[PDB]
């Protein structure tokens, strides 16, 4: 019922010690299940207590510090987001304060930037949502513990949607006791939902191998709209609208009034203005989820793209000297397979339509704090060069410009994608071809040939596929991979580079709709 026995739990800790079992062979993909993992608020260190039943898996030895046990953040091998513990014998508890036990199963992680909405959704909310669902009993029972050291931040209400239990910050841990011990704690975050890297080693851009699709993004979005008490019914008909993100701040669209009227007349549709500062986030999601089209300057507010309905168009505007192909966190999100969104990028090419602010503080794009020779190089540069992350002054100077949008220029850019009105399902892969057979042929003066046959993949018997083709590879015992062929039907006989006893390796695979490449069946050795 309500089993609270401090002495028995204390003896389990003093006799048994900490228990650790972790996934992954490297520290960049490691999530750890802990039992009786302890945290000393005085030392600000997690503690592994060695006892009778202690398990350390993996047991890295000195390699536990090369560089650490795991990544507490999803920003991969940062430097400031590592997790590690210090080792003590369980008997050392005799010389330490009486521990305070967390009977809740916990998820311990680091938020990267709780103030930036893009970082909140990409680094924290989506990884937390699916890290919880990796282990049974976490999705609706775990309490989140954020150890990075930031306050609640501007979007803490979003973190509280992930769990019925209120999350805890590191600063709140000292009020519980000098020595905290988690009876059951998971540590780390999955990187599987990430799609973008912020440019700490090479310039920023999309990840090389994105392991998430629009379907998984939209299942998370559907969960969030439910927690925000936003229905999923949609607007009527005739009430469709283009949604334009607005700002009070900076990075403004100076001719917003002209833009709203122009878009409304061009696309024969009402236009609506939305703002993160002037709307509750539930209202933001309510508006975005019916938007037939989303127009916004490049900024963190465009991460709300993941709430858009299928068939909507993202229109991202970039200020003067900002190359859209260099800053694609939202282009990547919108163009993910399964997202069912169209993306459009527009770039202000006209310097007479930009307004700079060189005298602002550094974090608002000001350049007054620099040598006048570097001020001159920035003022004369026509495009922000590629750079490494974070405090690049020319990037900050250009991204904090105000922009007068060239409306005809913008309409042409959108018209290359949206041909009529803006606004509103498959994706399966073939199986192996079955019973692949090949038959050499004796012909004429010992001519050879090769005839290959196969059955349809087993799952094709239940499928609605527009285009079904098959790809066949040949080879020559020990030479480079031969000709590839793409054919329509399950039969064929070959003619080129034939003739006697040669081991011909043949690979066959089925392909659905251009790009859905199925697996290769077992190779066929065909002797002539």
């Amino acid at each position: 019922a309500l089993r609270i026995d401090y002495p028995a739990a204390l003896q389990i800790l003093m006799e048994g010690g900490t228990h650790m079992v972790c996934t992954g062979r490297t520290h960049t993909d490691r999530i750890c299940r802990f039992k009786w993992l302890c945290y000393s608020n005085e030392a600000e260190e997690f503690i592994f207590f060695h006892g009778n039943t202690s398990v350390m898996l993996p047991n890295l030895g000195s390699r536990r510090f090369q560089p650490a046990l795991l990544d507490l953040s999803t920003v991969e091998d940062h430097a400031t987001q590592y997790f590690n513990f210090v080792e003590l014998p369980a008997a050392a508890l005799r010389f330490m304060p009486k521990p305070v036990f967390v009977p809740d199963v916990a998820l311990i992680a680091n938020r990267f930037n709780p103030d930036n909405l893009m970082h909140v959704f990409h680094d924290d909310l989506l990884p937390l949502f699916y890290t919880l669902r990796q282990f049974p009993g976490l999705a609706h029972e775990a309490r989140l513990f954020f150890m990075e050291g930031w306050g609640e931040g501007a979007h803490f209400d979003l973190y509280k949607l992930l769990s019925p239990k209120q999350p805890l910050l590191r600063a709140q841990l000292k009020t519980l006791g000098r020595l905290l011990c988690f009876s059951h704690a998971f540590v780390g975050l999955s990187k599987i939902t990430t799609w973008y890297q912020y440019g700490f080693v090479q310039p920023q851009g999309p990840k090389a191998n994105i392991l998430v699709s629009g379907n998984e993004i939209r299942q998370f979005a559907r969960f969030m709209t439910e927690k925000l008490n936003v229905s999923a019914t949609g607007v009527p008909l005739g009430e469709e609208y283009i949604l334009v993100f607005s700002r009070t701040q900076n990075r403004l669209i100076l001719n917003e009034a002209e833009l709203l009227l122009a878009l409304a007349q061009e696309f024969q549709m009402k236009t609506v203005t939305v703002s993160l500062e002037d709307h509750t986030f539930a209202d933001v999601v309510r508006l975005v989820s019916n938007a037939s089209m989303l127009v916004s300057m490049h900024g963190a507010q465009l991460v709300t793209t993941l709430f858009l309905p299928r068939g909507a168009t993202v229109v991202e505007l970039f200020p003067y000297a900002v190359n859209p192909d260099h800053y694609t966190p939202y282009k990547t999100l919108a163009m993910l397979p399964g997202m069912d969104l169209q993306y459009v990028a527009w770039r202000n090419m006209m310097p007479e339509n930009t307004v700079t602010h060189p005298e602002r503080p550094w974090d608002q794009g000001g350049i007054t704090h620099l040598d006048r020779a570097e001020q001159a190089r920035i003022l004369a540069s026509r495009e922000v060069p590629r750079h490494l992350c974070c405090r690049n002054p020319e990037w900050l100077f250009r991204i904090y410009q105000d922009t007068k949008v060239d409306i005809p220029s913008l309409i042409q850019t959108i018209r290359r994608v949206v041909k009529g009105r803006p606004g509103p399902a498959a994706g399966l892969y073939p199986g192996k071809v079955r019973e692949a057979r090949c038959q050499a042929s004796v012909h004429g003066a010992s001519e050879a040939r090769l005839t290959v046959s196969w059955q349809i993949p087993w799952n094709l018997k239940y499928l609605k596929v527009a285009e079904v083709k098959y790809e066949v590879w040949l080879q020559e015992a020990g030479e480079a991979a031969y000709v590839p062929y793409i054919l329509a039907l399950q039969n064929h006989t070959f003619t080129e580079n034939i003739k006697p006893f040669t081991t011909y390796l043949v690979w066959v695979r089925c392909i659905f709709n251009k790009i859905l490449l199925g697996p290769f069946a077992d190779v066929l050795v065909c002797n002539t």
Binding site: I4, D5, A9, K98, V100, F101, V102, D104, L176
Partner: peptide
């Protein structure tokens, strides 16, 4: 001696 999920009270 605390095994607490704990509410506050100022």
């Amino acid at each position: 001696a605390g095994a607490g999920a704990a509410a506050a009270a100022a």
